[PDB]
Amino acid sequence: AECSVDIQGNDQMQFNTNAITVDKSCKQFTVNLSHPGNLPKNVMGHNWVLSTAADMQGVVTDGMASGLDKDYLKPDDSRVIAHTKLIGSGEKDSVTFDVSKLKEGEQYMFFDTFPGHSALEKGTLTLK
């Protein structure tokens, strides 16, 4: 089964899916994020961050408070299962993570932590 997915971060602030399914068959999984538009990361940055559904809000909140300079992530946030860099327009980033970190039966959220983006740029990831 495929073990990769193309996700995109927008001016318009939208993701092309609000749902990812990672085949249980996969040992690693990669997300390729990319950014349509013309604006710099300091103004319209996008990342893709993965955590447990429970943790999502804390990760978003602590990341907003850590600044641009930490890519909108609290440093050493152990709730983050995986994440890309914070990217701006014309920039791409990929993250590959161990599928051993995902427990079948858990609910995962992916989201962007640039201030305010996670209200639209959010989605479900499930292991199947």
Q: Is 29 in the site for Cu ion (CB under 5 A)?
A: no
Count residues near Cu ion (CB under 5 A): 7
DSSP 3-state assignment of 46? strand
d(CA 31, CA 7): 7
Expressed in angstroms, the distance from the first to the final Cα of the chain is 11
Cβ proximity to Cu ion, 36 vs 101, nearer residue: 36
46 in contact with Cu ion (CB under 5 A): yes
* CB of residue 8 to Cu ion, shortest distance in Å: 10
Select from 73, 85, 83, 70 the least CA-distant residue to 109: 83
Q: How far is Cα 42 from Cα 39, in angstroms, rounded to an integer?
A: 8
Span interacting with Cu ion, options 7-15, 66-74, 78-86, 101-109, rule CB under 5 A = 7-15
Q: What's the closest the beta carbon of residue 121 comes to Cu ion, in angstroms? A: 5
Q: Least separation, in Å, of the C-beta of 37 and Cu ion?
A: 10
